[PDB]
């Protein structure tokens, strides 16, 4: 159905807490477009706030079309779930780095822009399109929230007792005890997505759970159990600096990032690989 009365509604792609992605298109100019139905706009905030930054999707469109709440922006690539799999579940060390340093660049937008993202997974991060194909670009879908007073710049203050935000996976540990959400932990979870590239998974993940209680139960205990060291055991001392410096950071701490990524550039050049810009899956 043709809504905001220039774009064509299409095949739905994706179902998801947050509303329905569709495929569709502008009947004007023809550019294929990724459109979102909520049941009859705090997204729309950050967007338009995030507008202009590097691998940040642009916003086409937002409103109300009848019963539902839309919003419309650039078609974008795979996710790296996607390419996770296309590749075995089994990144190259390299690529991994590769992504590492785009990644940590991003959140760092989010940052600086009084925004924390919530939900730092494979799932979120689509790689762009034509000459955009090599660029990671971050998606949210309602997570995103302030951290930070835009004018003020007084950061949110810290509090208890909340409820899982976020997937249970890449969850930081304070995240799972039920702590307000700050910056560290979407560096954190960012931790976790880069030790689920080296393994092809989590020691956590698949935990046999009668219920989804018991479920984020025993992952947030199996989570608490494994060691740093042990998780990243067999795999270069970045990613356990990395995974410690994060779990390091004060509530209200202004992370590194030129130290995190920097740590990661450390590591390419002493591992001795080529700077030819190329991802696993573009190769053979
Ligand atoms: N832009 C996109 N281009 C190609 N594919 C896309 C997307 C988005 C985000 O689309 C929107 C549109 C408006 C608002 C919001 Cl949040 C998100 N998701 N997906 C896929 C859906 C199925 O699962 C994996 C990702």
């Given at each position: 159905?043709?809504?905001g009365?220039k774009?064509?509604?299409?095949?739905?792609?994706?179902?998801?807490?947050?509303?329905?992605?569709?495929?569709?298109?502008?009947?004007?100019?023809?550019e294929?477009?990724?459109?979102?139905?909520?049941?009859?706009?705090?997204?729309?905030?950050?967007?338009?706030?995030?507008?202009?930054?590097?691998?940040?999707?642009?916003?086409?469109?937002?409103?109300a079309?009848?019963?539902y709440?839309?919003?419309?922006?650039?078609?974008?690539?795979?996710?790296?779930?996607?390419?996770?799999?296309?590749?075995?579940?089994?990144?190259?060390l390299?690529?991994?780095?590769?992504?590492?340093?785009?990644?940590?660049?991003?959140i760092?937008?989010?940052?600086?822009?009084?925004?924390?993202?919530?939900?730092?997974?494979?799932?979120?991060?689509?790689?762009?399109?034509?000459?955009?194909?090599?660029?990671?670009?971050?998606?949210?879908?309602?997570?995103?929230?302030?951290?930070?007073?835009?004018?003020?710049?007084?950061?949110?203050?810290?509090?208890?007792?909340?409820?899982?935000?976020?997937?249970?996976?890449?969850?930081?540990?304070?995240?799972?005890?039920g702590?307000?959400?700050?910056?560290?932990?979407?560096?954190?979870?960012?931790?976790?997505?880069?030790?689920?590239?080296?393994?092809?998974?989590?020691?956590?993940?698949?935990?046999?759970?009668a219920?989804?209680?018991?479920?984020?139960?025993?992952?947030?205990?199996?989570?608490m159990?494994?060691?740093?060291?042990?998780?990243?055991?067999?795999?270069?001392?970045?990613?356990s600096?990395?995974?410690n410096?994060?779990?390091?950071?004060?509530?209200?701490?202004?992370?590194?990032?030129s130290?995190?990524?920097?740590?990661?550039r450390?590591?390419?050049?002493?591992?001795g690989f080529?700077?030819?810009?190329?991802?696993?899956?573009?190769?053979?």
């Open positions: 159905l043709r809504v009365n774009y064509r509604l299409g095949r739905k792609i994706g179902s998801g807490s947050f509303g329905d992605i569709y495929l569709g298109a502008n009947i004007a100019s023809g294929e477009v990724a459109i979102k139905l909520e049941c009859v706009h705090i997204e729309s905030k950050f967007y338009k706030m995030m507008q202009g930054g590097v691998g940040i999707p642009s916003i086409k469109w937002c409103g079309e009848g019963d709440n839309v919003m419309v922006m650039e078609l974008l690539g795979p996710s790296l779930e996607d390419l996770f799999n296309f590749c075995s579940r089994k990144f190259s390299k690529t991994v780095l590769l992504l590492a340093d785009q990644m940590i660049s991003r760092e937008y989010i940052h600086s822009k009084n925004f924390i993202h919530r939900d730092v997974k494979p799932d979120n991060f689509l790689m762009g399109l034509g000459k955009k194909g090599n660029l990671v670009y971050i998606i949210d879908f309602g997570l995103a929230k302030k951290y930070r007073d835009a004018r003020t710049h007084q950061h949110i203050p810290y509090r208890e007792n909340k409820n899982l935000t976020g997937t249970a996976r890449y969850a930081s540990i304070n995240t799972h005890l702590i307000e959400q700050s910056r560290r932990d979407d560096l954190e979870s960012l931790g976790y997505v880069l030790m689920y590239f080296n393994l092809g998974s989590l020691p956590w993940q698949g935990l046999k759970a219920t989804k209680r018991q479920k984020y139960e025993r992952i947030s205990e199996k989570k159990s494994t060691p740093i060291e042990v998780l990243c055991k067999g795999y270069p001392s970045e990613f600096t990395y995974l410096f994060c779990r390091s950071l004060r509530f209200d701490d202004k992370p590194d990032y130290y995190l990524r920097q740590l990661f450390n590591l390419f050049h002493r591992q080529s700077y030819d810009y190329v991802f696993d899956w573009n190769m053979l």
